[PDB]
């Protein structure tokens, strides 16, 4: 169940981007904090498009997952607002935004150790979800948010969080699903309504490819029908320029779901790169 926040307390500011049938804006929330102190807190405001209110339940059940669980690497949900005849989620605002944008923007300044650390944090987050038998279903660099930059003076590493998954792939139309190849695994392309836990292991491999490819989008040059043919012909992604994680990527992107390794095994593999 969602803590109610008032339109009177929420201020809408600039657009921050788009998701599937959603728009996000930076916001300000007036609230009473610890010790009764008044705070105007930066917040993320996610709005389901009016033309697609049909997806409100999945849109809201997506965020509910992230409230029933608490973990250092999972975005917080503050609640919802009846901010007009409109369905709106109020969430944690992450200073430095999406990882895919950050990778592009700072490809020259990011080394393999920075990439390895972020991969470990994502894997730890996914391990937590696996242990709870929860399927995220939308793991991608765009949904990974940078809380904190590396501090080269002190050697302090970056810190990331995984956002909520958004509208489930089990209800999205096929044209959107195909656009999301190769994040959407092949077994979900042939039947979206049979999502298994193994889904996130495949998408984790794809996201790992983004991390090693400095923000590039794998298979962006292929249209939807060619992305389908990519799966039909059982192709694998090419080794990213930084080929350190190529074998882990292809091991996670296994066309047999049951053969994809546990996230415990993935973490030990990431640790064993030392
Ligand atoms: N929680 C959450 N904080 C935030 N801060 C955020 C958003 C945009 C920016 C920045 C921060 C940083 C500033 C700018 N430059 C300049 C310097 C650094 C980078 C970039 C702009 N973004 N963000 C989120 C983001 C998403 C979903 N959810 N949340 C999301 C989750 C599930 C489904 C769909 C979506 C919608 C899209 C992705």
Residue numbers in the entry: 536 to 809
The authors write:
JAK2, like other JAK family members, comprises a catalytically active C-terminal tyrosine kinase domain (JH1), a regulatory pseudokinase domain (JH2), and a Src homology-2 (SH2)-like domain that, together with the N-terminal FERM (N-terminal 4.1, ezrin, radixin, moesin) domain, forms the major receptor interaction moiety. The JH2 domain has a key role in mediating both negative and positive regulation of JAK kinase activity and numerous disease mutations locate in JH2, including the prevalent hyperactivating JAK2 V617F in MPN. Previous studies have demonstrated that JAK2 JH2 binds ATP and possesses regulatory autophosphorylation activity on Ser523 and Tyr570. To gain insights on the compound binding modes to JAK2 JH2 and to analyze whether any differences could be observed between binding to WT and V617F, we determined the crystal structures of selected small molecules with JAK2 JH2 WT and V617F.
Diaminotriazole compounds 16–21, in addition to primary hit 1, demonstrated substantial binding to JAK2 JH2 domain ATP-pocket, i.e., competition of fluorescent tracer was at or above 30% at 100 µM compound concentration. Compounds 16 and 19 engaged equally JH2 and JH1 domains, whereas analogs 17, 18, 20 and 21 possessed JH2-selective binding (2- to 3-fold). It should be noted that the conformation of the gatekeeper displays rather large variations in the structures, and it is unclear what the contribution of this interaction to the binding affinity is, especially since diaminotriazole analog 16, which also contains amide nitrogen at this position (actually even closer to the Gln626) does not make the gatekeeper H-bond. Since the compound binding does not induce significant changes in the ATP pocket, we compared the regions around residue 617 and the helix Cα between WT and V617F structures. In the complexes with 36 and 16, the switch towards the WT-like conformation seems to start from the shifting of Gln626 gatekeeper position, which in turn affects the conformation of Leu624. This leucine forces both Phe594 and Phe595 to a new conformation.
